[PDB]
Design a binder for these strands. Structure first.
Ligand SMILES: NCc1c[nH]c2nc(N)[nH]c(=O)c12
Ligand SMILES: [Mg+2]
Lengths: 544, 50, 1316
RNA sequence: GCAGAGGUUCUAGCUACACCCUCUAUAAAAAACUAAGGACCACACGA
DNA sequence: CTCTGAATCTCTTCCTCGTGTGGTCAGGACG
DNA sequence: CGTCCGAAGAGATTCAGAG
């Protein structure tokens, strides 16, 4: 248990415990020699003190007040230090045991995957599953001894890959992130062999993991026993974890690209090619959009068969001519039978998609919900790629009244300063009034910016122009809910706002420049204040 | 698996019990920890069997 | 006018504001600091002379012997930088100190000495600093980061809040010295001053005052006022002053000379106070009630006998007053106590004070400092005196003295280094005044109270420590040693002083390993300032307040560049214009405004002096005369941005980029992105692994020509001239005659470093960039280094970027990469490793390197040469043999599993006294042939200059050149050249040559001797062999590839070219990013940058089209002139009429791949200018084009953004991340996974994952991950046999770690057993 | 190693959990069997 | 006048994994 | 060849002053 075997350049000397034991033994031997030699009482007592100190250091070094040391003046590790703390054999080797049959790599999207499987590099799988390969190679007669199977494996012959494709068919693996706070951190997954060097993760399950694609690393463990393989199928597979343990809300929620694709798919334009046509069905809508005779979002009249489960376990068909766009009609094919049609007739932002998934899970069973989620993700990706939604400088529209609002706010500030000079108001009153008028100016600027972005588009509706919800890429990315709230849009076109001083006092002069325009040096410093404060807060938030 | 023992010439007290939160041996004898600390390290005399 | 470097590719500049100050030499802080550590300083101030003079009196105690230091002289390094790097030694210069030992006569202080012993003694070796600023310590490069620590001096604090849980303010004061113990005065909640020395237990503050030979009366009169009461028949009438009356209510009828002003119990109103001053009466009638609760100020003894009636600081009761009145004490001095203004803080401390005189105070201090020791009078006196007044222990530095005097509001600057009595009493007085209300606390985070300790100060301190240790040694040696026998060399050893310096330079918290990942990475590391280290905040200890950015960081410390993570804000980067003051505080240049004109004189302003002055902003339009056109100019007076007039402002900023650091300034359009994405993008330019073919940044800031030249990555010309012979490894430049030195001059050989290992395992290659005949001028970069193109920092490549979602492959942060990127080898980086094999003397004889390994195949030995080393050029892979180490009875080094590549070179280091092996002999033979070749080549071109010099001058004089050439030209002494001013030099040179050839032959023998001699090695080793492997990694799915602004993300899929989106003209894009990352993460700079890159590439393509079809140079000239102007009052104003036909042609070729555009950080290009730039080509002015799709061929509606963004590959590759191991060697605890990638390891199933498993119904997998998978000696083999047989069962067993725990607890004297 | 002895090989190979074969004085005819040292401290970086 | 509530004095703890770099110790004669 | 040579709270404490 105390090794003393570094064997580096013949040194053979690395035991902190061994040094302490030698100290104790030497003190005891000297005490025995003095006792048999009838030494003076003071010397015997001094040696007794030394022995007591040595025993104290051996049991718990550093408890008396001094620490036995000498290795670069660093305290020695006693027996007590090997049990307590975060490094003793109680929290480092008994609870968190390192395991075999494990791997580690970076993550990749791989949207082609289903919900219950994930990518796994071939070179990683050939080492994770080596014993199974040996066993099957011996069983099939390809090799005779374990050495022959070993050589066949290192040669990476063509037969080895075919064998590996058999021992990987229904063998779940436990993909696991590093900070697994909740139980959804470690989830099972069926392996799909790829040729890269990164474990691909299904995009939908990148939210429960808190998974990220800026170089985040995951660990791949391999269940081995039959009970483990059954459990990593009936208790931990991604299909069985739909609702979060804490709150009864869905955990597979479309996050960024699929929601934008569905939002762009299910909208309306006041005048697009192919308006007023009476479409036969969703098949005809798909044929018409693919051909090009019509557009994705154009109000038409298409008959749609809505299946309702009002009767107990019976699906009643209701065919009617519902007034809806081409894009909504195309999406109807994805939706299963049970759900009604009103779910896919709205703008279909993000809460709408989450509610659609939840209603599918309620009315239908869990089995159709997985397929619905997969089809939704595929359709969203495809029709977001087809959209070509891109951000440009011309998209960030600065409200035209900004300069007037700023000038009027500065005039009010000057008036308040004049009142302060005359002694009518106090310093604190002046400060509060300035803060209030600047806040009012900020509110007006934000309102003007929104009014110039949300409904700016005016389109010719077969005659007089008609106002329509805008198709601005920033507005499409903010209204749907893909990425970015209203405040972040405000910071890009309107004034940044009243930034705060490190202590907490709101600085009188606000940043009257957006990010589209130039930011002054002083304004950038004031922004740096808050940015640094936030980063420093998070750095210790994690540990707490 | 096997261990060994060292025969101490003079008796030695266990620091885990002497110097802890409640001072086990101090509590048992109802003596302040300071006096026990002094006598244990050969500083003062406690007169057993008065 | 531009230099020939700038005439090849002149960068279009969009800066609008004129500059006055040029960017200073970036590595000045380190270089100047180390310069003031070895430069001979005659006065003996900072440096080495200062320390030597400080600790060299060396007078033995009554030993009639003195050792004096007279001078020091640094030696000459044995090996140069290249030799030190290759061999593995420290770049050091031996220190030769000339001492003198004078032997006084026996007990003759008034007498003289018998003899002197002036002689030189070698005293350690100090490492030297390479010109770049790196230290060669053990063959590697180490950089000592500067330290930012709280300045020595007094610092009043508040410490309000948590203490006392009642909001009471516990004012304190710490006198922090530069070397000693911290004196800390602290106020108690009950208003009791308590001195706390060295942060030990609390002592009453009166004890310190008593310890200074101060009696009670002295303290009372020092820290209090005095109200005088006089014995009078008129109710003991006392003197009074109206000023003291203000503040509190009067409790008695204030009257004097039969005139009543105030009544009894009447509050003294303002009018009452004014009429009281108007009355101006000294003595005011008082009753006995007022004097009832009065504290006396001095002791009063009776006159009849002499006994004390009352003591000092005693409450005078009525009986006491009567007794002192009848005793005859006319004067009654009671201390004044204004409860509002002057509190009784000192009196209460005196009440709690347990001592009475100096002896008791010293005894108490000795007891506190040294518990368990008998308090001795002499011992206590010595301890207290040394601790607060001795030159040996307490040393307040000059900066400390200045800070102390400024904080105490004194007048003189230079004082002393020992805390005096007046200093202590003044600190106490100011603390009391602060407690009263007058004064304010001092903000610690203020940059005027934190100073920079660079390399020089730390080296001086360590050398001082070593010198005082050797002084301690020599002091004892001198006394008992025999006199007039031993030399100074005997009493001084080198080890005890060399150990400190070597330890500081080699192993310290500030001697960090240099990271040569980039030319920018090296510059950032040298200029970094870190709080952590000796005398600095630890990461855990540091609070949120330290991590914040103070308002006084403007121009002194970068507000953006800070390592995110644990130490956020603790290691900040120096600004681009900052420069340390004389004392050590930071400074920032400013322009002086006298009346209304901005004078060009720049005065560097300290942090403190910045406050009073009102400083304007750089973004203030001038009028070409110095007057601000705007009547109201924004300013920054005292941490408060405001709007002042032109008649008040007296200082202005020098440049718009003086706030940001070097790294953050390189980011273009930084004025647009957030302060968080800029933070995360500034830390991502220092991890860009250099690519294969350097590509200039299409759009850059303008500082790309400073980080490259200032760093040592590129070889800059030392003397101007014309290139003679340029090769792929060497460049020889013949200097111009004016630059040429008169004798032994003519050629300046530059040797370029070929592929060599870096500190982070990359390639450091230097490619020539000049041609034969090109006129090279002083300061021109003639050879680029890693990540450098034509002397311009090029960390990555510019690719065609299109922002659009593509089938979900560009998810949250993923990026699509076309196969054109991989095919052209745009990001293929070279990586070099270094495997080593050491042969050491062993039991039963030493090991040998012979290729005689037992039990190995001929194929294994095929790579090995007859001697036993692999050929240079063999393509070895994993498992192959590299050396042939044979140990006395097959321990030869093998390529680690996974590592591949080709061997570039092999080094065989041998020890002295051991014969070199045949292969060593063959490298040494080639090196000595080539070392001989180098001396011969140097001699030949030296004769090209010398014999040419012997010529150029031989022809002038009338002597026939043919006659001179017929005889040997070198020895033309026979043909007497006509005497001239160069003939004497030539004759001297020819005489030298009939002699220099012999001297050069000795020098060649000496040069060859260094190569031939075996290098000093570690004790016990015979010879070591180092083999370098070089791989060429390419782009793989998973490799992180980020931009400059902050957009990061791994590569998702290498899509084929045909499937990538293609625009109308047919050219496919190369990267398809995700647009959804811009709206939330407000890095809107990466869109503007894209537009500007597209415009630049458009102009480049137009120029290329003009070049493809042969066109007249006039058309190219006019088009390039049009592009260079673009209006908007651009600063550059480049003119092409001063150029030549060939010059314009060269420029056209160099700009055919895009026109580089400069964009200063905070004064860059506006949107209108970018639109004009785009319209100058033919690209759409909006910036978005109709991008068709590859697969379907259909058109993408809603046109997308296409441009050119500068993408750089991060070095967090994926080949160094994948690691899967089924089984591996066990640990001491018997747990199978050791961990890590180097040794086959398993990922740790931490407590968090165990809890996550427990949350599910997981019970069998937990058992099989805790027992049969990690540590069960009887379970792992059983399960392996079961698995290779077919049935996947499991035997639980019991973990070995549990048995280890049981044994550890049982060894502790506690019996723990597993009961049944 | 049936017990003793020797053993092809596919490091080493009656124990590490081991295992098998042939042979009768001592090595030589043959296939099937299995994974060995990791003590501490500073510095940097990523999610 | 003896233990109220009120200080006073030591003690324990402070995310979780990777990727890595460098430095690394008891105590030299001695019979 | 050995052989000797910051902070934040908690426990773990006293000190105490009044009714
Ligand atoms: N470990 C036993 C052993 C050594 N050599 C061997 N040769 C053979 N054929 N069989 C074996 O079992 C052995
Ligand atoms: Mg991430």
């Amino acid at each position: 248990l105390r090794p003393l075997v570094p064997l580096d350049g013949g040194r053979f000397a690395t035991s902190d415990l061994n040094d302490l034991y030698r100290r104790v033994i030497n003190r005891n031997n000297r005490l025995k020699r003095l006792l048999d030699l009838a030494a003076p009482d003071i010397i015997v007592r001094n040696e007794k003190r030394m022995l007591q100190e040595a025993v104290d250091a051996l049991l718990d070094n550093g408890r008396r007040g001094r620490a036995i040391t000498g290795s670069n003046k660093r305290p020695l590790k006693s027996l007590a230090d090997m049990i307590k703390g975060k490094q003793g054999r109680f929290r480092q080797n008994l609870l968190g045991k390192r395991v075999d049959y494990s791997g580690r790599s970076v993550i990749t999207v791989g949207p082609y995957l289903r919900l219950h499987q994930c990518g796994l590099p071939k070179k990683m799988a050939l080492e994770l599953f080596k014993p199974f390969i040996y066993g099957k190679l011996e069983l099939r007669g390809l090799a005779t001894t374990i050495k022959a199977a070993k050589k066949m494996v290192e040669r990476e012959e063509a037969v080895v890959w075919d064998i590996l494709d058999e021992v990987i068919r229904e063998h779940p693996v436990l993909l696991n992130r590093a900070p697994t706070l909740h139980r959804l951190g470690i989830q099972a997954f069926e392996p799909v062999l790829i040729e890269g060097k990164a474990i691909q993760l299904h995009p939908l399950v990148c939210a429960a993991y808190n998974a990220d694609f800026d170089g985040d690393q995951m660990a791949v463990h391999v269940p081995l026993t039959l009970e483990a393989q059954l459990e990593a199928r009936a208790l931990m597979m991604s299909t069985n974890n739909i609702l979060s343990p804490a709150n009864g809300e869905p955990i597979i929620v479309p996050s960024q690209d699929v929601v934008l694709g569905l939002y762009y798919m299910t909208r309306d334009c006041v005048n697009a090619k192919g308006e007023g046509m009476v479409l036969t069905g969703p098949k005809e809508a798909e044929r018409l959009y693919r051909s090009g005779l019509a557009s994705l979002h154009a109000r038409v009249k298409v008959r749609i068969t809505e299946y309702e489960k009002d009767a107990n376990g019976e699906l009643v068909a209701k065919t009617s001519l519902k007034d809806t766009t081409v894009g909504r009609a195309i999406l109807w094919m994805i939706v299963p039978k049970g759900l009604p049609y009103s779910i896919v007739n709205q703008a279909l932002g993000k809460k709408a998609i989450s509610k659609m998934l939840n209603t599918c899970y309620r009315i239908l069973g869990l089995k159709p919900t997985v397929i619905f989620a997969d089809q939704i993700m595929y359709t969203g990706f495809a029709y977001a790629a087809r959209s070509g939604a891109s951000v440009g400088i011309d998209d960030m529209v600065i409200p035209e009244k900004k300069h007037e609002i700023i000038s009027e706010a500065e005039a009010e500030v000057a008036e308040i300063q004049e009142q302060f000079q005359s002694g009518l108001v106090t310093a604190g009153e002046r400060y509060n009034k300035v803060i209030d008028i600047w806040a009012a100016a900020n509110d007006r600027v934000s309102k003007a910016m929104m009014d110039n972005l949300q409904t700016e588009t005016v389109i010719n509706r077969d005659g007089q122009e008609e106002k329509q919800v805008s198709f601005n890429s920033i507005y499409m990315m903010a209204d749907s809910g893909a990425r970015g709230s209203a405040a972040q849009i405000r910071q890009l076109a309107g004034m940044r706002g009243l930034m705060a001083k490190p202590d907490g006092s709101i600085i009188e002069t606000p940043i009257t420049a957006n990010f589209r325009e130039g930011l002054n040096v002083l304004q950038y410093f004031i922004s740096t204040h808050g940015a640094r404060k936030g980063l420093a807060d998070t750095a210790l938030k994690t540990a707490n | 698996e096997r261990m060994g023992h060292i025969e101490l010439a003079s008796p030695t007290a266990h620091i885990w019990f002497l110097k802890s939160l409640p001072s086990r041996i101090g509590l048992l004898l109802d003596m302040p920890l300071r006096d026990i600390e002094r006598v244990l390290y050969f500083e003062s005399y406690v007169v057993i069997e008065g | 006018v531009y230099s020939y470097t700038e005439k090849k590719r002149i960068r279009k500049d969009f800066g609008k504001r004129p500059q006055v100050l040029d960017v200073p030499y970036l590595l000045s802080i380190q270089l100047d600091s180390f310069q003031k550590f070895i430069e001979q300083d005659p006065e003996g101030q900072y440096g080495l002379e200062a320390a030597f003079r400080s600790v060299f009196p060396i007078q033995s105690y009554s030993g009639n012997s003195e050792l004096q230091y007279v001078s020091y002289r640094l030696g000459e390094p044995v090996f140069d930088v290249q030799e030190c790097q290759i061999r593995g030694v420290t770049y050091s210069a031996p220190l030769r100190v000339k001492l003198r030992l004078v032997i006084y006569e026996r007990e003759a202080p008034e007498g003289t000495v018998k003899d002197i012993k002036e002689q030189e003694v070698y005293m350690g070796e100090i490492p030297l600093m390479t010109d770049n600023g790196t230290f060669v310590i053990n063959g590697t490069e180490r950089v000592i980061v500067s330290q930012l620590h709280r300045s020595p001096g007094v610092f009043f604090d508040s410490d309000k809040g948590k203490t006392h849980s009642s909001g009471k303010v516990l004012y304190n004061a710490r006198i922090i010295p530069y070397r000693g113990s911290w004196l800390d005065f602290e106020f108690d909640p009950k208003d009791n001053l308590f001195v706390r020395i060295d942060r030990r237990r609390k002592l009453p503050a009166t004890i310190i005052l008593r310890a200074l030979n101060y009696t009670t009366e002295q303290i009372l009169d020092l820290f209090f006022e005095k109200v005088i009461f006089e014995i009078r028949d008129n109710k003991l009438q006392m003197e009074l002053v109206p000023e003291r009356l203000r503040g509190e209510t009067a409790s008695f009828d204030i009257e004097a000379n039969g005139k009543v002003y105030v009544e009894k119990g009447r509050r003294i109103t303002a009018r009452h106070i004014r009429q009281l001053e108007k009355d101006d009466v000294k003595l005011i009638e008082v009753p006995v009630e007022y004097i009832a609760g009065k504290v006396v100020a001095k002791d009063y003894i009776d006159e009849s006998t002499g006994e004390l009636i009352c003591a000092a600081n005693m409450e005078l009761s009525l009986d006491l007053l009567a007794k002192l009145s009848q005793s005859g004490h006319k004067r009654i001095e009671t201390l004044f106590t204004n409860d509002l203004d002057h509190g009784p803080y000192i009196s209460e401390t005196l009440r709690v004070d347990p001592t009475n005189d100096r002896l008791s105070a010293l005894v108490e201090i000795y007891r506190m400092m040294r518990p368990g020791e008998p308090p001795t009078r002499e011992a206590a006196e010595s301890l207290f005196e040394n601790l607060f007044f001795s030159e040996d222990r307490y040393d307040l530095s000059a900066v400390g003295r200045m800070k102390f005097n400024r904080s105490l509001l004194r007048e003189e600057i230079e004082g002393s280094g020992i805390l005096s009595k007046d200093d202590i009493i003044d600190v106490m007085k100011k603390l009391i005044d602060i407690r009263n209300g007058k004064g304010e606390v001092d903000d610690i985070d203020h940059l005027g109270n934190r100073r920079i300790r660079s390399v020089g100060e730390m080296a001086e301190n360590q050398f001082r420590v070593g010198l005082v240790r050797v002084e301690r040694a020599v002091k004892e040696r001198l006394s008992l040693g025999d006199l007039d026998t031993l030399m100074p060399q005997d009493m001084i050893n080198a080890k005890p002083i060399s150990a400190a310096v070597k330890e500081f330079f080699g192993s310290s918290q500030l001697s960090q390993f240099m990271d040569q990942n980039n030319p920018l990475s090296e510059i950032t590391h040298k200029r970094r300032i870190s709080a952590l280290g000796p005398g600095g905040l630890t990461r855990e200890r540091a609070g949120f307040e330290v991590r914040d950015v103070h308002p006084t960081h403007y121009g002194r410390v970068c507000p953006i560049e800070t390592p995110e993570g644990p130490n956020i804000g603790l290691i900040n980067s120096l600004s681009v214009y900052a420069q340390t003051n004389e004392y050590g505080f930071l400074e920032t240049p400013y322009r002086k405004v006298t009346d209304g004109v901005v004078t060009d004189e720049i005065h560097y302003l300290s942090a403190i002096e910045e406050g009073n002055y009102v400083i304007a902003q750089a973004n203030s339009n001038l009028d070409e005369e110095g007057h601000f056109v705007e009547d109201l100019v924004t300013c920054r007076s005292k941490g408060e941005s405001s709007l002042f007039s032109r008649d008040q402002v007296d200082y202005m900023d020098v440049s718009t980029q003086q706030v940001v650091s070097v790294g953050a300034s390189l980011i273009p359009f930084l004025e647009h992105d957030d302060a968080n994405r800029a933070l995360m993008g500034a830390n991502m330019q220092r991890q860009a692994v250099p690519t294969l073919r350097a590509d200039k940044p299409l759009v850059g800031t303008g500082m790309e020509r400073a980080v490259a030249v200032d760093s040592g990555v590129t070889a800059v010309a030392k003397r101007g001239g014309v290139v003679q012979y340029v090769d792929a490894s060497r460049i020889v430049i013949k200097v111009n005659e004016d630059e040429m030195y008169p004798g032994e001059a003519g050629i300046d050989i530059y040797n370029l470093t070929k592929y060599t290992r870096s500190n982070q395992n990359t390639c450091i290659n230097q490619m020539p960039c000049v041609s034969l005949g090109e006129p090279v001028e002083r300061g021109d970069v003639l050879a680029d280094g890693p990540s450098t193109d034509l002397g311009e920092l090029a960390l990555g490549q510019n690719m065609r970027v299109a922002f659009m979602p593509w089938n979900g492959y560009n998810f949250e942060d993923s990026i699509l990469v076309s196969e054109r990127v991989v095919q052209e080898d745009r990001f293929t980086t070279i990586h070099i490793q270094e495997l080593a094999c050491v042969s050491r003397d062993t039991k039963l004889g030493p090991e040998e390197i012979t290729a005689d390994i037992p039990n190995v195949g001929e194929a294994a030995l095929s790579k090995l040469d007859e001697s036993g080393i692999v050929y240079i050029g063999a393509e070895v892979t994993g498992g192959d043999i590299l050396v042939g180490k044979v140990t006395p009875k097959d321990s030869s080094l093998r390529v680690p599993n996974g590592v591949s590549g080709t061997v570039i070179d092999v080094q065989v280091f041998t020890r002295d006294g051991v014969e070199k092996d045949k292969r060593a002999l063959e490298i040494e033979e080639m090196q000595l042939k080539q070392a001989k070749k180098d001396l011969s080549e140097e001699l030949q071109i030296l004769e090209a200059g010398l014999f040419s010099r012997i010529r150029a001058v031989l022809v002038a004089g009338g002597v026939e050149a043919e006659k001179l050439d017929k005889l040997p030209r070198d020895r033309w002494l026979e043909l007497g050249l006509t005497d001239e001013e160069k003939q004497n030099q030539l004759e001297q040179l020819a005489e030298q040559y009939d002699e220099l050839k012999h001297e050069f032959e000795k020098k060649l023998e000496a040069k060859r001797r260094k190569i031939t001699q075996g290098d000093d090695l570690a004790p016990g080793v015979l010879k070591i062999v180092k083999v370098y492997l070089a791989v060429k990694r390419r782009i793989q799915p998973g490799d992180k590839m980020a931009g400059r602004h902050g957009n990061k993300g791994v590569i998702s899929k290498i899509n084929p070219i045909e499937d990538m989106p293609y625009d109308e003209n047919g050219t496919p894009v190369d990267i398809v990013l995700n647009p959804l990352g811009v709206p939330s993460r407000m890095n809107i700079g990466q869109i503007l940058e894209t537009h500007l890159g597209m415009a630049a590439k458009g102009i480049g393509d137009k120029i290329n089209a003009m070049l493809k079809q042969q066109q007249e140079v006039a058309k190219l000239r006019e088009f390039i002139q049009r592009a260079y102007d673009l209006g908007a009052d651009v600063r550059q104003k480049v003119d092409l009429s001063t150029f030549s036909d060939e010059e314009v042609m060269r420029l056209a070729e160099n700009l055919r791949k895009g026109m580089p555009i400069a964009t200063p950080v905070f004064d860059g290009a506006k949107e209108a200018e970018i639109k004009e730039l785009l319209k100058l080509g033919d690209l759409p002015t909006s910036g978005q084009i109709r991008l068709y799709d590859g697969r379907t061929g259909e058109q993408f509606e809603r046109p997308v953004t296409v441009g050119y963004m500068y993408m750089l590959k991060l070095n967090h590759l994926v080949d160094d991340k994948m690691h899967a191991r089924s089984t591996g060697s066990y640990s001491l605890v018997t747990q199978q996974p050791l961990g890590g990638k180097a040794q086959f390891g398993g990922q740790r199933f931490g407590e968090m994952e165990v809890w996550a498993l427990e949350a599910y119904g997981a019970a069998y997998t937990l058992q099989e991950m805790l027992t049969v998978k990690s540590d069960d000696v009887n379970g792992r083999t059983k399960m392996y046999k079961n698995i290779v047989d077919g049935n996947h069962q499991m035997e639980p067993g019991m973990p070995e770690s549990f048995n280890v725990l049981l044994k550890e607890i049982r060894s502790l004297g506690i019996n723990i057993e597993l009961e049944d």
